[PDB]
Structures are given as structure tokens and as C-alpha cells.
Amino acid sequence: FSMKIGIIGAMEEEVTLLRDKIENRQTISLGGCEIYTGQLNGTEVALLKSGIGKVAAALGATLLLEHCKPDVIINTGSAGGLAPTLKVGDIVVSDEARYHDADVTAFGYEYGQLPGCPAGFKADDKLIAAAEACIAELNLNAVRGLIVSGDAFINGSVGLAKIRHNFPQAIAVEMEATAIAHVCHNFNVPFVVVRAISDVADQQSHLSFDEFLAVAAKQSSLMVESLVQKLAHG
Amino acid sequence: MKIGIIGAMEEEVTLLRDKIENRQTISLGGCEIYTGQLNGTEVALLKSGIGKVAAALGATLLLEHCKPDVIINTGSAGGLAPTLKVGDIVVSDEARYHDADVTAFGYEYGQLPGCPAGFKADDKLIAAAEACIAELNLNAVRGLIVSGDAFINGSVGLAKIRHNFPQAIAVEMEATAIAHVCHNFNVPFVVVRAISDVADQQSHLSFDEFLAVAAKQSSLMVESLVQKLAHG
Ligand SMILES: Nc1ncnc2c(CN3C[C@H](CSc4ccc(Cl)cc4)[C@@H](O)C3)c[nH]c12
Ligand SMILES: Nc1ncnc2c(CN3C[C@H](CSc4ccc(Cl)cc4)[C@@H](O)C3)c[nH]c12
Numbered sequence: 001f002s003m004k005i006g007i008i009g010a011m012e013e014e015v016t017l018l019r020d021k022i023e024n025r026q027t028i029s030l031g032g033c034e035i036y037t038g039q040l041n042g043t044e045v046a047l048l049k050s051g052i053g054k055v056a057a058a059l060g061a062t063l064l065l066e067h068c069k070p071d072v073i074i075n076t077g078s079a080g081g082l083a084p085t086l087k088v089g090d091i092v093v094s095d096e097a098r099y100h101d102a103d104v105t106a107f108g109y110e111y112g113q114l115p116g117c118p119a120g121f122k123a124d125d126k127l128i129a130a131a132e133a134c135i136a137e138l139n140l141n142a143v144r145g146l147i148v149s150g151d152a153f154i155n156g157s158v159g160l161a162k163i164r165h166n167f168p169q170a171i172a173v174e175m176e177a178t179a180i181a182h183v184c185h186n187f188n189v190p191f192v193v194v195r196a197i198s199d200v201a202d203q204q205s206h207l208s209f210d211e212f213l214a215v216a217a218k219q220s221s222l223m224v225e226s227l228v229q230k231l232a233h234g
Numbered sequence: 235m236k237i238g239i240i241g242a243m244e245e246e247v248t249l250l251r252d253k254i255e256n257r258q259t260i261s262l263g264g265c266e267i268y269t270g271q272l273n274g275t276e277v278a279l280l281k282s283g284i285g286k287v288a289a290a291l292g293a294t295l296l297l298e299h300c301k302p303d304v305i306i307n308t309g310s311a312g313g314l315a316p317t318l319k320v321g322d323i324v325v326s327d328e329a330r331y332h333d334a335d336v337t338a339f340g341y342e343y344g345q346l347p348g349c350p351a352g353f354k355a356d357d358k359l360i361a362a363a364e365a366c367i368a369e370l371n372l373n374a375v376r377g378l379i380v381s382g383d384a385f386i387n388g389s390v391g392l393a394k395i396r397h398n399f400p401q402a403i404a405v406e407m408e409a410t411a412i413a414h415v416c417h418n419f420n421v422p423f424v425v426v427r428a429i430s431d432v433a434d435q436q437s438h439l440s441f442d443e444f445l446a447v448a449a450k451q452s453s454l455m456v457e458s459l460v461q462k463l464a465h466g
Contacts, residue, residue, distance in 0.1 A: 031415075031418045032348075032417075032419075033418075052336075053347075054286050054290075054383075055287070055289075055290040055410075055411045055414045055415065056348065056349075058286070058291050058294075059291075059414075059415050061291075062263065062295065063298075066298060101333055101384070102285060102383040102384065103384040103391070104284075104384070104385045106387040106437070106438040107385065114283075114284050114285040114288065114383065115283075115284040115285075116264075116284050116288065117288075150333075151286075151331060151333055151334040151346065152336070153335065153336045153337075155338040159335070178287075179287045182288070182291075183263070183291050185264075186263045186265075186291060187263055206338040206339060
């Protein structure tokens with residue numbers, strides 16, 4: 001009864017469903033961000049709306065950790081699906097996060113690695129196990145594996161090809177997860193990403209996202225709600 | 235007046251750090267912040283680490299813990315403008331991400347949703363930096379500086395920057411992140427960096443050779459600019 005779960009979503013649509021469900025809700029406004037505090041089905045939560053891309057996610061995550069000191073972080077939201085069995089609405093769970101757009105290979109760092117960081121950030125094993133238990137209980141289709149982040153909306157063409165080449169094992173792509181993982185790494189806070197597929201990052205991904213962002217928000221929010229309850233009680 | 239100063243690499247902050255008197259160190263989130271006085275002016279110097287996220291996390295800690303009135307971003311840069319040589323100064327009038335692309339939804343190339351397409355540096359800070367450049371007889375260019383999470387080393391990476399930002403005068407990896415955090419907190423910023431290489435196919439070798447020259451030139455400029463701002 002003394003756990004506080006931090007949850008981070010980038011777009012307002014990505015946090016609005018959870019935000020609705022928060023009891024005794026209060027809003028903290030700082031640094032261009034909002035954090036909603038209160039309880040989700042009894043469990044104390046702090047839900048950050050970060051805004052879009054790596055710096056917004058990093059600024060937001062840093063305020064959430066400093067102001068709220070959550071025990072763990074769960075990153076919720078939509079994603080572009082890369083793994084072949086994924087369909088719109090399916091869940092993706094991070095094993096690990098990597099930047100697809102960092103390149104200091106001129107000095108022999110690994111592609112995707114920034115100097116001062118590990119080449120990728122591992123998500124927490126217990127959080128991952130708890131997410132997989134929720135996926136089973138909810139009877140959802142999910143893939144676990146590497147999620148890659150960058151400051152680009154992937155829409156086929158080179159951008160997609162470059163990711164498939166550099167990270168053939170990446171299951172999904174998005175724009176905040178890695179930055180949240182990098183902040184959590186620096187503060188020793190366990191994280192997991194539990195997103196849902198809104199598009200498959202190909203030349204029609206903008207139209208698929210226009211159509212399916214809400215479905216992905218709903219599916220990822222349902223998972224996060226289940227996860228929070230499982231973590232809190234088992 | 236409290237002046238915030240941010241450099242990414244330890245080599246980019248060390249010279250200033252050696253000069254801070256009444257010095258205390260805050261160690262937090264993988265960053266270090268050194269507080270005290272630089273030639274009688276209160277400063278807070280952040281060593282942020284490398285790239286956009288490190289810079290953003292560190293800038294956010296510095297603004298929260300130290301509440302500086304302004305931010306100056308110091309360090310090295312890849313020179314893009316034709317009149318630039320190694321050691322020369324670049325001063326931002328504006329900062330943009332060269333690697334942000336949400337053009338699929340019709341944002342401007344380099345713009346992230348929720349941000350302006352570029353972040354404008356502070357006119358009073360720019361004017362003070364140009365007075366310092368003239369007094370020290372330096373060669374400098376003022377203009378757009380672009381940031382990304384890549385060390386630019388010629389070939390297609392460089393070509394893409396030149397296509398998208400023909401007006402960019404230099405490239406680096408943190409400034410626009412610092413600008414964005416400053417934007418969100420309504421804190422004025424300026425970038426005053428110096429050229430270690432020209433972001434071409436041999437930029438790694440030039441950086442091997444001239445990082446220290448650039449850290450020195452940018453640090454000496456910063457020290458002069460601090461003095462000018464606080465004391466005229
Ligand atoms: N193909 C893809 N590529 C990168 N990220 C995503 C995402 C996940 N995010 C949703 C969102 C897409 S970019 C955008 C567009 C308009 C507006 Cl108002 C706000 C943001 C980013 O937060 C990352 C889903 N599919 C993606
Ligand atoms: N051609 C270029 N491209 C991008 N950034 C820079 C910069 C400015 N920075 C220095 C540094 C280059 S990457 C690097 C390599 C070794 C180690 Cl230990 C740590 C970092 C980044 O902070 C950005 C100078 N030239 C640049």
C-alpha cells in the first residue's frame with residue numbers, strides 16, 4: 001500500500017482515458033507539461049502528459065521523477081508496428097529501448113548509442129512479466145522486444161528502410177520511449193513501455209494513424225490500467 | 235543576476251569549472267552542476283553529457299535547482315558557414331533540430347509538434363556576445379545553429395543538413411534541446427560555441443585535433459560575456 005506508479009503519455013489523446021479514471025485528481029502544471037495525480041482504482045499514480053518527441057519526453061520525465069518520485073515508470077501510447085505479426089490495436093511491450101536516430105559511429109560508438117549511455121536501455125524484468133500476465137488475462141495479441149525511438153514520424157521510404165536495416169529486431173517505433181528510458185536509467189528507476197499499434201510505419205502510416213490513434217490509445221490505456229492493478233496487488 | 239552555463243563534454247566545461255570560486259558541486263541524474271562565482275558573478279555551470287536527451291534532463295535540473303536568469307550554451311561545434319575556421323566563434327540567433335521530421339502531418343521540417351519551428355535566442359545576449367567578439371578581435375558568425383543526435387562527418391548526413399538548412403552556420407548535438415527546455419520555462423538563452431571541425435569527411439580527425447582549441451575559445455568568450463552582462 002505504499003507504491004506510487006508513474007505513467008507517461010506524449011499526446012493528450014494518449015493520456016486522456018487514464019486521466020478520466022483518476023480519483024481525487026489534481027493537476028500539476030510546470031515546464032509546459034501537466035502531471036495528474038490521484039488514484040487509479042485505488043493505487044496512487046502520477047500521470048504525465050509530456051508532449052511530443054525526445055526532448056519533451058526527457059524534460060517531462062525529469063519533472064515527474066523530481067516532483068513525484070514514482071517507484072516505477074510505465075510509458076503508454078501508440079506506436080508504429082514493425083514486427084510482421086502485428087496488427088492495428090495489438091500491444092507492444094519493451095524488452096529494451098534504443099534511439100534509432102543517434103549516430104556517433106565516427107568515434108566507434110555502436111549505432112544508436114550516445115556517448116555516456118549504454119547502447120540500449122533494458123526495461124525492468126518484473127514489469128515486463130506483469131505486463132505479459134495482463135496480456136494473457138485480457139486475451140490480447142502482443143509482441144515483446146526492442147522498441148526504437150526518434151524525433152521522426154515514420155512514414156515509409158528511407159526512414160523505414162533505415163530502421164529495418166539498423167535494427168532488424170525492432171518490433172515497433174515511436175518518439176519518446178527511449179528518452180524516458182534514458183532519464184529513468186540516470187535516476188535508477190525501473191521502466192516498461194506498454195504501447196499499442198496505430199499504424200505500421202509505411203507510406204500510409206499518417207492515414208492509418210489518423211484512423212486508429214484512438215484504438216491504440218484505448219488498447220494501451222486498458223493494458224496500463226490492468227498493469228497498475230496487478231503491480232499494486234498481484 | 236545568476237548566469238546559467240551548460241556544456242556537454244567534461245572538456246567543454248573544465249576550464250570554466252577551474253575558474254569558479256566559492257565552488258560547490260550538485261550531483262544529480264547523472265549530471266553535475268558547479269555553483270559559485272566566475273570573476274565575481276554568480277553562475278551555475280552544468281555538465282550535461284552528450285546529445286539531446288542528456289542536455290534536456292540536465293537543463294531541466296539546472297533551471298529547477300538553480301533558477302538562473304539566463305542560459306549560455308558553451309562548447310565546440312561543426313562549422314557550416316564558409317568564412318569559419320577552426321577556433322572561430324558561432325553565436326546563435328536561433329536553434330532548430332535538423333533531425334526532427336513530422337512533415338507527414340505538415341509541420342515544418344525540423345519542427346516538433348507543440349514547439350515553434352525554431353527557438354529564437356535572446357537579442358540582448360546576442361548583442362553582448364557580439365560586443366565581446368569585437369573587443370577580443372575574434373572572427374565569428376551569427377546565425378542558425380542546428381542540433382541532432384549525430385556527429386556529422388560529411389557524406390549523406392551533411393548533405394541532408396545543407397538541403398534542409400542552407401542557412402545553418404554550425405551543427406552540434408545539444409543547443410536546440412537546451413533552447414526548447416528554456417522555451418518551456420520562459421528563460422532567455424544564447425549559444426556561444428567555437429569551431430572544432432567543419433562536419434565533413436575528416437571532421438573526426440579535426441575534432442581529435444582541435445576540440446581543446448574550441449573548448450578554450452568558447453570558454454574564454456563565455457567568461458567575457460558573463461563579465462559583460464553582469465558588469466557592463
Ligand atoms: N509511425 C510512427 N512513427 C513515430 N511515432 C509513432 C507513434 C507514437 N507517437 C504518436 C505521435 C506521432 S507525431 C504527432 C502527430 C500529430 C500530433 Cl497532433 C502530435 C504528434 C508521437 O508522439 C509519437 C505512432 N506511430 C508512429
Ligand atoms: N561535427 C559535429 N557534429 C555534431 N556535433 C559536433 C560538435 C559539438 N559536440 C561535441 C560532441 C561530439 S560527439 C562526442 C565524441 C566523443 C566524446 Cl568522448 C563525446 C562526444 C557532442 O557533445 C556535440 C563538434 N563537432 C560536431
